[PDB]
């Protein structure tokens, strides 16, 4: 069960189901090319590659390296607010 912030890399804040773009609050470093898993109740957990990331001002980022910054990127299946994201080994 969930004890600390070490256990995940992002918290989903929002998801645009028309465009596929998720809004994620970073908790630990992740970057384009990384594999992640989205999880939590109400979804089947799934993995994907992170293709490209941007901030809320539309700047592309080489990495989401700043704790609790809000970032955006395309996801491969729908998400609900407060689903979670972790790195996939």
> How was it solved?
X-ray
Residue 20 gets the label, from left (phi > 0), alpha (psi -120 to 50) or beta, of left
Q: List the beta bridge partners of residue 10.
A: 26, 85
Contact in structure between 14 and 56 (CB atoms under 8 Å):
no
Please report, for the domain that includes residue 24, its CATH number: 2.40.30.10
In angstroms, rounded to a whole number, what is the distance separating the alpha carbons of residues 77 and 20? 7
Contact in structure between 1 and 39 (CB atoms under 8 Å):
no
- Domain count within the chain: 1
User: What resolution in angstrom units was achieved for this structure?
Assistant: 1.1
Query: What is the rounded (10 degree) CA torsion for 17, 83, 38, 56?
Result: 60
Structural domain of residue 7, as residue ranges?
1-89
In angstroms, rounded to a whole number, what is the distance separating the alpha carbons of residues 68 and 34? 18
């Amino acid at each position: 069960s969930l004890k600390t912030t070490r256990e995940f890399a992002g918290l989903v804040l929002g998801y645009d189901p028309e465009t596929g773009i998720a809004t994620v609050q970073q908790r630990n470093h992740f970057r384009p090319g990384d594999e992640v898993e989205f999880f939590g109740p109400e979804i089947e957990n799934f993995t994907q590659v992170i293709e490209k990331i941007w901030d809320e001002d539309g700047n592309e980022l080489d990495a989401a390296r700043h704790p609790l910054q809000i970032v955006k990127f395309k996801v491969k299946r729908p998400l609900f607010p407060y689903n979670m994201m972790r790195k996939e080994n």
